[PDB]
A paper describes a structure:
[name]-53 transports certain subsets of newly synthesized secretory proteins and membrane proteins from the endoplasmic reticulum to the Golgi apparatus. [name] is a small protein composed of an EF-hand domain with two Ca2+ binding sites, and functions as a binding partner of [name]-53 in a Ca2+-dependent manner. From the amino acid sequence, [name]-53 is predicted to be a single-pass transmembrane protein that consists of a luminal carbohydrate recognition domain (CRD), a long stalk domain, a transmembrane (TM) helix and a short cytoplasmic tail (CT). Here we present cryo-EM structures of full-length [name]-53 in complex with its functional partner [name]. These structures reveal that [name]-53 exists as a homotetramer, not a homohexamer as previously suggested, and comprises a four-leaf clover-like head and a long stalk composed of three sets of four-helix coiled-coil followed by a transmembrane domain.
The two different structures of the head region suggest its conformational variability. In component IIhead, two CRD dimers rotate along a vertical axis (i.e., nearly parallel to the central coiled-coil) in opposite directions (referred to as twisting motion) (right). In the superposition of substate structures C and D, S-H1 and [name] in the upper layers and those in the lower layers rotate by 2.5˚ and 1.9˚, respectively, breaking the C2 symmetry of the head region. These rotations seem to be ascribed to the flexible loops between the CRD and S-H1 and between S-H1 and S-H2. Thus, the two loops within the head region likely generate the plasticity of the head region, allowing the CRD-[name] complex to fluctuate continuously in the tetrameric structure.
Author numbering:
A (entry chain C), E (entry chain G), G (entry chain D), H (entry chain H): 40 to 102, 108 to 144
B (entry chain A), D (entry chain E): 42 to 367
C (entry chain F), F (entry chain B): 42 to 312, 324 to 365
Write the structure that this text describes.
């Protein structure tokens, strides 16, 4: 549910950056890879995260695993929005995202 | 006003569906074909009906809805058109734009076929209903039309963006005509003042097709809860400081500008990636017909060339036959 | 034959009208509305009559006029049509295509309304008159028609061009149908042999409008005096040597090329459409098919006359 | 409300002009060509400007104006358009739709050319002005547009009828789209609330033409003074009785029904009178272009016919040449 | 100015009915010819008379005569409307026209 | 030859689908959406794949299939294109035009996207695989193309008709270009001589869509078993006499005429458009020009072979 | 399965002719309705019947009932083609159809 | 009346080239500006001058002044055609125009 170790995963970020950018690096800073995470999961391009993008981030398909129920997804995203988003805009910014 | 994006009542690409094949927080029925980029609510086949509604009811007093959609037809006449509902009971199937009749709520109908024969279509019709009034299907809801602006949303080069705002019992419909790729280019269409709608209800969309057929795609659906500046409690004590904001946003911008240059040398480094323009995608109906006529003339051109070649062959055959006798 | 453009009996754009508001060397009367690029002889209002004639009389024995015009109607039926006159007196206002009846000269009528009801309109009718017989308005001049034609000139995509030539007492009318923008694409319409006309007279054009209404615009009117190669006396030693012409024309072409390159960087330095281009391409393709079939006809005629001489042997 | 037809600010066919050649109670200037049937305010030539204004000023607080007009263009794009003014001074010549700029009053512009390039034309734009604000010619008055509905009035099969009503400081524009011959088939276009206009002023109409050219005809202009039912002086003393009304109207109806039968046997008795439909008058631009292509193909058909006939002639010439030798 | 003898003119009505109806009658009742007058001058077809129709009715062209000035035309039509039209509708009905 | 229509391997409208929702005697898979009048094998969404195959296997030595289809795209570039298979096993889902690779039979590909980049698309490619050839997807099967063609079948005003005939171990593909509504107007596209295919197998059709999007509708699919006149054994005395046929057909035609008259007064008793009719007239005129030029070519060939025999004498 | 009584059904022909033909007749000769059946069920307009058209004729909804199995339909159509069609063209003509 | 000084006028050529040509030159050879004059005043694009084009060239408004009489223009154009044009074609060519 968007834990500290969940975002801090070099392998997931390396898999996502594969293909789009051909720069396989060895080791990166936790803030650097969390910046990569935040930039990569923002599909729309508004430099913001929301519930629809976090739903893609959580319920993810790599290359088997059972699909998460809708109620658990709703509870997780509602908790994340209630905890991180302080401006009550609905969106999550990098300043709000850097707290956790 | 103050806007809050509500994710439980929204869907966007490019991951609009899941591995299961259904839209999250949305139930679809009929001939709707959800894809990973758009929902084809009613395809281009004969007698299609489709609808996509929300699962949970939305309890808002002031809200804003942004619907991006496309209605593409081979001919110049639409089938039925789209319909955006804020009704309290989900109508999965029915005879009104692929949705059930006698609804308790508001419906914005993008009617594209002139049943009444008044030559006033395609047009956007806002209709409120309290659940005991049938829909005048044969007259495009002319009697029930609270406000009806006229705009063309078919075969546009860019997706049509519409915005429906309920605020202080006033429903404002502002429609981007789909001529420019700019997003914030909305143009006013209609407004309805002092309309009573149920406090809580389901957001839905639907489409239907008659004898003539159109493709009714919906690319995105966005829901924003709207609150007055005075009513919303600010509570600024939860924010830490502006110092952390100043410490964070400049490194975010620096990371973006560094990643741009990082991608720059490998965009052209690997020549496998290729682009594609969006101009040849759009072509008008009259332009397509004229192109079809121009293509049809090529058969006549080739046949005349073949005839000229055969006539030259017989001319040369008579040319060589003269000197043989003498 | 040799042709000399007489400017005193001509008008053309894009500076057709002056600051005064009148056509130079031309007197207009009726509902004619001269403009910068064309002369609307009769607009699309009800019961309009207009005419534009020459001021001075033209004394020619062999002449040629090239008239470019448009007849545009909202409906499928024309009002009255155009008329091109070579007369003795200025008709000005009148009841015959916006010009006076009982004229002494020749008149080419582009009739676009079938008064006779014979379903033979629109048509081109050449009528000579000595000034003593009234024109048959209710029968489209069927009895007086020296030579008729059958062309449609209404609502064409391109201006309709006509060429009327009086040469050796023969009047030849050759009409472009207005399907191609090419100027010299005339097709034969009618001819009259051994017709007597006054030696000197006025050149004019006129138009009228009846129950229905069309717009009768005239874009240009060019008059050429024609003379025979043997009849025209040459003037030796008056012309300049060809060496100076060769010296001059090379610098003229070099300067026009340099001016093209000079215009190139300022056309885009300081800032048709789709659909119309497709229709233009369709019409160009039709014209190409027509020209190719004409070439096939020429080749078939060539092989036919090749076999013609092979029979008597 | 109560309507009174004011003849001093109106003109109608089919005796619009007089033997002098001018419109009664109206002054025309520019390239206006008044005729008995209609007034062509701006013809289909390049750079035309025309205007027709009232001579005497109209002093009304609530009024209604019914404008019947046609805009016919050969192409699919118009140039400038019509403009209906209620001003303080006669604009006459000027650079705004053939009328003077900086007007003190209200003006409804039927713009048919998109100067702004927003692809939102033709459109109806209501603009108020106090006499010191320049009109945005290059942007179709987008900033000054109080209310802008979108409708097509060009190349319609029937004359377009518009109705502009000033009532309780509210201007309502209701536009018949000109698709049906019915008169009372008005459809709502726009409204402006709480607009201040001068108490007395001139009624006028004007038109202009740019690069492209349209014909801008106005067939009729009707003015009605509007009064509230409560503010209407009753004065019923002038009305004598209903008995005379009952004694008169039935003989009027009997005279009408007798005159109909009187005309019936001589409508067909004299065969000189002939009718004419109004369907072939209307033809769309695309339909005209397709008909032009079909007409152009006939030359190709006839030339191919000639080719075939000549080939038959040479075939028969070779047919008769065989048996002669033997 | 729309007098009793002006409407009561058999020759003017006979000239107007010429062509449209081929029924030349000898003598008609004054009410009959005034009915013909009212029906003929109603160019539009609403069975009503107004200022614009009365202007063409007064300033008339038969087969010379000088044209009436605008001020006299305005005064005559205003007087006729003030006298005959009692319902203040602007139009003149046959019931209002039969008074004079 | 003698052609027996086999209903078990065919489908057509206007009752293509049943109340159950499946095509009779046909199994569909993928994103195929059968309807009352047509089967959309692949709609215009991103990454669509569909196929319709036969349930039972067809055992024919000479056969003919007449396929009517439409490929309609908003843009000017096709997605993948159609494919018509005569295979040994039902491919169903797969990566080759929405069908499985490694097929044992013949496949006709209506490729509409140029993967090779040779600017030679859309094109018709006949490929006969025998179970160990992987279709060259990135090169449009250039190496495997037994016989190619070059036709445009996208965005045509009329449905495109194709006829594929296996006769005496020769496969002939004749394709209507879709410019005329006439059915029997096929033009030669390709042929393959001496090709071995399995004796019995499944008839199928399939389509696929890439990043670009096209709609691949199939309106009909008719299969005819072919046999030679000499090989087919006659059955004398089984047929009925011609007298009964003459008795019956006259009353049939009389009844259909009477039914036409009966429908006449109720068509109007109880109650196309402009512009479309003009476009139809334009296409009809183009077809007439094409037919007249074909007749001219036949006449020219006749006079050419007339002069051919005149030389040796 | 295309029986003598199934074709000779007045109510079925009346139901099929409803809407298209606004002429309810009382009684018709058996050949007359059978001609109406043959004309109505030929959708392509080639004056011929085939297995697909026969399958549509037999298995249609009308106005619940379970659909017939595909094997039974195949057997019925095969029997009809083997019995009536003698020219082995695959199509069923009225000359062949008049036998049954 | 098409004099040597009238053609050799730098300010007139600069005014005519204004707008169309965004290149204000300082000084040009007399043949250069006379070529610009000849090219500008040929509206039809046939590389030829005639009486109508000469009349437009002489009598044009520019930026009040009374218009020249028609007889004077006729005399001037007749004199120009009689002097320069030697081929009697009606048109004025640059070969004929280079004399004056
Ligand atoms: Ca985002
Ligand atoms: Ca936030
Ligand atoms: Ca509708
Ligand atoms: Ca409607
Ligand atoms: Ca005539
Ligand atoms: Ca005639
Ligand atoms: Ca404008
Ligand atoms: Ca605009
Ligand atoms: Ca009236
Ligand atoms: Ca009254
Ligand atoms: Ca390919
Ligand atoms: Ca290729
Ligand atoms: Ca059949
Ligand atoms: Ca048979
Ligand atoms: Ca020239
Ligand atoms: Ca010369
Ligand atoms: Zn991942
Ligand atoms: Zn009179
Ligand atoms: Zn049935
Ligand atoms: Zn100058």
């Amino acid at each position: 549910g968007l834990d500290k170790n969940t975002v801090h995963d070099q392998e997931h970020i390396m898999e996502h950056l594969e293909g789009v950018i051909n720069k396989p690096e060895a080791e990166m800073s936790p803030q650097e890879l969390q910046l990569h995470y935040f930039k990569m999961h923002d599909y729309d391009g508004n430099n913001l995260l929301d519930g629809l993008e976090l739903s893609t981030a959580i319920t993810h398909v790599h290359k088997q695993a059972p699909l998460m129920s809708e109620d658990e997804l709703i509870n997780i995203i509602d908790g994340v929005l209630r905890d991180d988003d302080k401006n009550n805009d609905g969106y999550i910014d990098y300043a709000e995202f850097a707290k956790s | 006003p103050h806007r809050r994006f509500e994710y439980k009542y929204s869907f966007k690409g490019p991951h609009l569906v899941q591995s299961d094949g259904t839209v999250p927080f949305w139930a679809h029925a009929g001939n709707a074909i959800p894809s990973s980029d758009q929902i084809r609510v009613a395809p281009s086949l004969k007698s299609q009906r489709g609808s996509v509604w929300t699962k949970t009811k939305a309890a808002f007093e002031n809200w804003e809805v942004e619907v991006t959609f496309r209605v593409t037809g081979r001919g110049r006449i639409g089938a039925d058109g789209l319909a955006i509902w804020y009704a309290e009971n989900q109508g999965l199937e029915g005879p009104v734009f692929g949705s059930a009749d006698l609804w308790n709520g508001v419906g914005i109908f993008f009617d594209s076929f002139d049943n009444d024969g008044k030559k006033n279509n395609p047009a956007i019709v806002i209709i409120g209903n309290n659940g005991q009034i049938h829909y005048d299907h044969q007259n495009d809801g002319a009697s029930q039309a609270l406000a009806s602006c006229q705009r063309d949303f078919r075969n546009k080069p860019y997706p049509v963006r519409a915005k429906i705002t309920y605020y202080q019992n006033t429903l404002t419909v502002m429609i981007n005509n789909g001529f420019t790729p700019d997003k914030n280019d909305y143009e006013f269409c209609a407004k309805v003042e002092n309309m009573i709608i149920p406090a809580q209800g389901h957001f839905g969309i639907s489409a239907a097709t008659g004898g003539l057929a159109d493709d009714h795609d919906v690319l995105s659906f966005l829901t924003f809860q709207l609150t007055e500046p005075g009513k919303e409690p600010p509570t600024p004590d939860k924010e830490i400081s502006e110092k952390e904001k100043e410490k964070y946003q400049e490194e975010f911008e620096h990371f973006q500008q560094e990643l741009d240059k990082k991608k720059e040398e490998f965009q052209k480094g690997h020549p496998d990636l290729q682009g594609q323009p969006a101009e040849e995608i759009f072509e008008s109906v009259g332009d397509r017909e004229l192109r079809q006529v121009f293509e049809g003339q090529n058969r006549i051109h080739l046949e005349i060339k073949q005839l000229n070649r055969q006539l030259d062959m017989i001319l040369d055959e008579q040319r060589r036959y003269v000197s043989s006798l003498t």
